[model samples]
Target: MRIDPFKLAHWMNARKYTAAQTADLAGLPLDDLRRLLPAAATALAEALSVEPSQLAADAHRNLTVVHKSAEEMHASRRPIQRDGIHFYNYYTLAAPEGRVAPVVLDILCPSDRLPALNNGHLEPAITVNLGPGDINGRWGEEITPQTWRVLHANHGGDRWITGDSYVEPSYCPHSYSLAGDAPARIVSYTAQSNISPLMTEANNWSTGAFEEALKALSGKVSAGSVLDLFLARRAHTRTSAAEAAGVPPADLEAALRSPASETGLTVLRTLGRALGFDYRVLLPADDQGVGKTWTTIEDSRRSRRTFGTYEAASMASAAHLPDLVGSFLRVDDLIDHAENHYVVTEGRLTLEWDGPDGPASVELEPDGSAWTGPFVRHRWHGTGTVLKFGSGAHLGYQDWLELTNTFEPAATLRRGRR
Candidate 1:
């Protein structure tokens, strides 16, 4: 996860860890640790073989948790200032790949502050923006995920801006300033992947021209390749199924026939909407092609597959299933999109596509139970296969749900399919 090295330092200070201890945990000397707080914290966390939470708590205890009044929290609070560049105090926790570390970050004004710019590195730095607020004026020439500015005007106000006109790392001169009257504040967190330098460079370009340039350049990079790969694979499979089935696939028919009763289709539609995908249900043989097929029965309707198109389409559709499934499907829900490739025999399964990070998987039984991340990828290998649904509707007895309650006051829990 991408995180601000400096913010990690203040968090360490807030926890009361002695400068020495903080430095030790951060894996830097006291002097250097003070300068690179976040990096230090990350290093310390890695070296100590402990979670950042533990290190943060320890640091907090070592330091005093200064209960800042509303005014103090808002009052132009600049915890670290050097050469006019003010680094505000803000902390956040994020689970980009269902894991903690490499958290994204948001750094307040670096150009207006002059101090941060004094270093003469205009080539935008690849940093995370974790704050909230509209930073209207303080933005530098360039801003991107890698090189950008964050504005935190109020307690909850946070905003981020990026471009390409950024100062080059070795030669660009910059400063930091607040856009409006409100004192600038910052909120920060880490991410699962690194921000690209191109994004940073674009942030430095002229605003009016930036949008057009971005529009022209958008999709040139593979930001959502994994998602695309999954979707493309599913589409190919679905098309092949349509050619083979000679008719609307049983699953699609069941969904179009009874939208509410087809839980799998419902979930698919919902996920497609969430991910900004155009949802379409195609039947086998409708396109008159050859690929995969399956057969099953649902609600007393007899459905048969002439080819394997149904199975291909179902598996492809299942490939793009939501990261969390158990939250949406309950035991009572009828599974509409179940084939050999996408199976849930005994319980529910939750899969998370790590975007650029990687692929991760999770599972839960019918009972309300849970587990942390670092889930095994292919643990269900060699398991016995059981088919219950008849005709074109084939599926295991187990159910799946997608959880919307992301990590927060409580962790997301997935129940097993009983």
Candidate 2:
């Protein structure tokens, strides 16, 4: 049977090791490992300098957390269709839950796929995330399965899994397979702002722009070496460039790029990425197509300088600030971390929000110079913070840094009581 998800023995073999490998690593007979006793925990823990009790605790702990994690994950799922098949994807877990760090999920399929809870089972559930080392060199850091799972989570609540591993906010294996006698329902977790097959193949709306970029690179970077340069950058190519150019490199310089689509747009984007530029930097096709990798830097600097200042507390202590649009504040729900929301109105700021403690309000003075009662920070225009509020909620406002852009100097942000 599939070793239980709560068993350390199951985790050992699930390390993608062969049966012999598992035995050898555990310094035990294959049969001993298959029946991995609690005694084995002492042996394994001693080998790793951990207490056997802790090791055993971890196994059970992981199982309990993973099950709860799976529920939260499963509840947030959505259907993803590809190759004329459907699959489900899940995001979130019961423990840690990305509040501190990202975590991986269990794979429960082919022995290679974490097999099953089984016919004399194999790997029951092994955590996985798409990354360079993951199957197919998919995408993402083992951490941060997304530029956002937060993206959809931001769209509203927990609905993030999309079955399309490419856009899945978080990912785990379904209890099936993409193989014979198995359900083809497969799932994946994805990172946003990453070059994606789904994104590239979804639409060829920007083809002309890609051609325009290639045409320019062909002209500026060189007269007869556009293909060579792209190859050197370790980018992708749809066809044999050597045959097309009457020559190919003796040994490829970089990784052959993502085989995005039959169309070369994906290849071009693949090339853009290898050259150290976010592909979105080339988006909108640059009407005149005068864009280059360097342009991305300039835009970043501009974006940062824009969000450089502000103060808060319902603008009570700060009435000198202009009424601006597209700003935000942090809301404390008498919970951990903080929830930030975009500003809809800042004029004599009055906010009515519902939290687990029922409804609450924090109003501002007519001139927004001072406040009474459960007051929160206003984060003025850019970055400001309110240290506290009544009740368990520490609701406040602060200008959050957009890490993708040039960050403002710490001195640029002013701090004061609301």
Candidate 3:
């Protein structure tokens, strides 16, 4: 839904539309001309004699090849001090403009002090280190008000650094420390989901209201619970609701009792119509935490699959989050418009991409990384492992593209004015 206003302005300039003419010809308000207005984009694109997709692609495109070498990262490393002692060195990766970025952390020393216990940011993060050495990590969850319970990355065992990857929830606090004399390097991808606007709105609510709202969203949401909630809200008893739905009371009762009931889709549709709601609302939603999705190097081998010329291994991921992808790429796999961040964990590789200008390539050594935006036709010719992790950037969802199909004449002008 976010179009680049600069790209729109550029096209307007190319078309020789003056500031006043841009607003007047495109039926856009003067104030909103420089702002990103989805409604006004269609007319503006038409006036500029370019497709709206062109404007969008240009808006989100990263023109430069973003890469940071090992030396660059080493130079950028800044110490994270705790009580005047350096705890770790943080090296930020070269990343394209987007919601998330990868940061390389070199945990230098061990300490009981948890200098920064992120009370959790809105984005979920995954920490991974395909290493010659192991890592010591910790996670904390507040079981009750003001009472925090901390657990080791192993969750309590001798499995210290064997597990190379783990996912951290948005509400949990996680930190890492060096367990040995050698500093352990870690790569963390903190990607944002499209839920910040809702969070911002909730933040403005009363304290009690906000707390209660979080409580409502904290637990597992099953189809049974959804049905029960709707039934209660509508003041309909189970027997009466089932009768109205033309379903047997026994069937309805079974569904209400079990979260994993094998209720048929057709029956659910009928019930949905009778209950005056959508049946899909009753789908299961995971709320239970993935305490630690610990995956070892050996486990990754079992998950490896052959690609065209190289191979890829699946890494630790949360079932609740399908948008986040963590893969060990041994070579090339063409990706279409999924914002990617990669770090050369081992060996050397050549990354070639056909950009707006022409075909360009960059060679990456160990500790080197690059970030590319969407629509980049790129491939890797290499002989080593690269940690590829990024967000799916699910852009073609209903809410984002529904506007393209449902535009009305003069509606855009109205949106601009108001």
Candidate 4:
């Protein structure tokens, strides 16, 4: 298999390995790496600890843009059934490998039974309630041995779900039902984040060890616990870390263990200094609980902003998950830095992009979906409202900072481009 030199260089940069270092590790010539020339997939894969297939670009990735029209999506629709009873129709959309895939789920029947519940995926999901009226959904969890708690939306408390859009944690068993005999639908976008790589690594660990890892994230996240995790990673005890930072050990422990503990900036800064890291690392995300964000259409309209020549509205987003960004985009010629997946919900539009293979364009209508890789200078022509979702490809701000700090811009560009 032919490996992508640019991708190989990217992996090398991500691992903080120079071309010469990667060459030595992969047993490939330094010239081949520096000159952006292909090398043995197996050796490179072994060096990177990734599958050989990952070193090569696949069909889904080769195309800078793939458009699936509404008719095509309708053609691909399949019934979702349980125990020989069909209850929903799943319409597939355009999705590249390793990214979030959106599905149009048409609810055909109503039920609150356990049989309707589904074993969810490891990837977290964002759901948009595209309804003519309110619908019902059931969230289930195993509370005790041989006992389960299936919470219903009709309960009208935290689960009332008045939000048009919401996000859920990984493997959250959920089921949906229609209020009346009337049809209802939803667009579900399942995002692949660090969970993908984390799960890949977990596959090699013992079940007991993996269980412990999951247990760490079982409780509510707090700022103190975040700091504690950094300390644990560095093999530093809470007492020692607190003493070094000139704070009381009991206070530090309280912050780490107490869900309601208020950890001020001064203590956070001192703790970070003692831990040999940045203070920002100790800050917990605001969306740690529920993993759901309630955004109405009016709220989306109010959150509108201009991107290049196009206008966009913020959709469901959480501070905890920055890799997946959802928005409503007003079609126009706008180049994007992140990988984009879009569905034209209204009107018609033409997608124009400077692809890896040069210029490309595709026309789309309502229910049309398309996928574009990162930094593919692209824009939309004509009038339309598109539901655009983007992926950071697991490359967070810290990763970019480290890469920029380590590599000279000119050298990196020369070595990474064709």
Candidate 5:
């Protein structure tokens, strides 16, 4: 009984491994790996997804093209062009203030651009890709048939490690056809500041403009709900431990446990300091036989450093907000947003815009404030209604509600005698 030469050649060439790599992995000597083939028909059979006894039934057919010519074998031995199964990156990371090692894996996305393999086990902590744009870089949606790539990284040497697709950190590897051609999207599956993104960015400052994101989260999960989780996770209630920890047990208890009270908000703010979703889903060895070793985890940890909360978390949450609130934001709302100062005349609030237009203002009113700049529209949305702009910029009622609450030309505007 012998291995089928044509089948063997086909398998090796079609897959990304070279003879040397296959030999190295299979524990066979290159010189006589072919000579040794007859004995391992069972292993070889499995590699070909065939059964041995079934293959043995017609050994002559199975062993077709028995010998390989030197020229034919040498061609297969050439260095693999890495484009298909791998990616490369050179990022620097350092240990954090208290961590013994650098960050292991992001709390949100994959650590590298995963190969076009199967969508990994719903890799994100959000449990799914929330964006039509954010879906592909890591999420493998059968982009092509009959081929699923196994992703890994090459350390510019002989070193290669599997990507974190299964671990599914909070980083979408930047650069690709999907996701609007922006850097890969970052999401809010993180609570740590000591982490950076990708194989990737300086922890991209990407988030919602405090409107839609605030609504998606704050409206759904309020201070009280957040407090509920924190208290549930917190071991101590009102105790000597809480007292020493500076969270007065009685006050902490009174503030958090009660529902919809002022104390709930106060305690919510207090809990915010010590509590959050680590947003991590540790990876074990997948069924692919590509085990994420401790070394892999260590390698991941060694790549992280303290970037910050807003960069890693808050702004990260906003990463897909643009896609979410696609048409709502206006040139007036976002452009040059952090105004050094602005003014108010009658009832209009004027500030510097951060969009294409530099400076603009929206009228502040209970009935329906109108904008003299880009957000110009004369419609009243009572609450939570998605408001469409004259400029095709859509504003959610959350954005509408929030826009009115924050800007007081009476206050934020420094030069105000208009």
Candidate 6:
């Protein structure tokens, strides 16, 4: 392949490529290389399909490039086990004019014995994995939380790291190895900013809140105080207690109906911690959803899809219905009596009738951007009821539900009017 000298220069500068590698790759001499830095960098930007100014700006900004011998970089004495991968931490010193300080970069190199699998979100930075010729099967799997893997026709390829991406440490979860005689060398960079301080802060807050909540609850705190403590404590829990009570476990409902002396509150708190769902109850019945609403809080802002607004109602409703269907009711009981059927319908909708055998059905629009789901499909005459389950993740103007009934003459279907 024809290498662009200017592009090579930029890559060298960004990675701190050695003088020899730069000269060999860029086809330049040691003395002449210094003179070509400016022009070569510009050419490199063009070759790499990036703006020349971006190259200059990045060099001026976060650039810290260095080179190490393969032995020196790989000298860390971590033994390679059947499932072990090696990690090396290197520091990238900030440029003189840069705003950010020196940040650590984690370099992961995999051994030939056990290749990695496809998983998502290892946190901190983007990850890339490669397979050697000795490996085989699929190079990548189609999965969520997009991570990229590529095979080298000759020797090696680079996987760029970004600030937003994370990879689960299980090698290349999305990509497979290339079958052949030689083992492939893999290299990946994880940005240092994604770790350290964030974890420190999270650990501190979680520990402090947990201790405070334990203290207050142990002291026979007032309902208001207990609830406040629970909320603060719940903030640190992965699952909310309200979600557990409303859905899978039904702990929230149990606590509300039980007396203060029955330890329902304690059960609720314990369940919240174990299941990672937030829990709360409204007592007066004059407020939201019969004075109580259970919820499983999730942080959608931390997710990759950027443009949509997440509503709490949709999340709670979706999480709540499945528990009502499978665990709480008997299929035989459902079929035995018409009155029993009525009770199942009236009590809480566990399974939505309209879709496949699963609990919910999702339908996407032609553009694939919008979708609808968990709607009840009614049979029989107009007397039959089809309750709609409204969790609006992809519910927009473009995507909607369709209702079919044998009741009306000609059995007309109601389409996307909502």
Estimate, for each residue in 1-418, the C-alpha lDDT of model 4 and write its tens digit: 4667667766877889887788899898877767655346788889988887766854453557777888998898898887567878999888765544678888766644334678867766667665544455556554342222212121232111222566666777776667655557777786666557777899899999999888887786566666668888988877788888899977766555543435666676667776677765555556542324656555665677888777777667776667767777775455466667888876788888887778888888878999876666778888766778766652555566466556586686685565
In the range 1-418, model 1's lDDT, one tens digit per residue, is 3334544554555676776876676567877755544565568767545576654532211111011122322343335555454454442221122233211123445444422444443222222111233342232445543344432232321111111111112234544444444443322111111233566787898998898766755662221232344456566444343344333455544444444444544544644554444333211112110011111112002222322111110110111212211111112112223211122222444423332345544443221122222221222212222111111111122122222223431232231111
TM-score of 6: 0.21
Residue-level lDDT for 371 in candidate 6: 13
Number of clashing pairs, model 6? 34
lDDT of 3 by residue, 1-418 (tens): 5566556667877888887788898887988875553687788778778888867734344464588887887788788876467777888877755634588887655544444454566678777763434555655543342232222232222221223676777766656665444446677887766577687898899999999777767676666656767888899877788899888987776665553445655566678788787675575656564344666656666787887776777677877666677887775346654567878866678888887779988888877888776556678886766778777444323233444445683596475445
Highest-scoring model, lDDT: 4
What lDDT does each candidate get? 0.32, 0.29, 0.67, 0.68, 0.31, 0.32
Candidate 3 least-lDDT 10 residues: 151-160
Q: Which should have the higher TM-score, number 2 or number 6?
A: 6
Q: After superposition, how far is residue 3 of candidate 1 from its true place, in Å?
A: 30
Those runs of model 1 whose alpha carbons end farther than 4 Å from true positions after fitting are 1-86, 89-176, 180-182, 189-239, 247-418
TM-score for all predictions? 0.23, 0.20, 0.69, 0.71, 0.20, 0.21
- Expressed as tens digits, the lDDT of each residue in 265-300 for candidate 2 is 354445445454333322222211001111121222
Off by over 4 Å in 2: 1-71, 77-189, 194-209, 216-408, 411-418
Task: Candidate 4: list runs displaced more than 4 Å.
Answer: 4-63, 97-100, 110-115, 131-134, 141-163, 211-229, 232-275, 287-292, 301-311, 397-418
**Model 1, residue 390: what's the lDDT?**
13
- Report the lDDT tens digits of candidate 5 across residue range 1-418: 6554455655666666677765665556776545533555655556545566544523222110011222332233322123463232211112122322111111222334444333232122211111222323333344432222222222232111112222233343322222233223212122222222331352343555444334544544533454444446765343533454466666765654443465554544454445432211111112221122112323433443323210011111122122121111111122312101111111222222333343333333211212222232222211211111111122433334455656673464343321
* Minimal lDDT window, size 10, model 2: 316-325
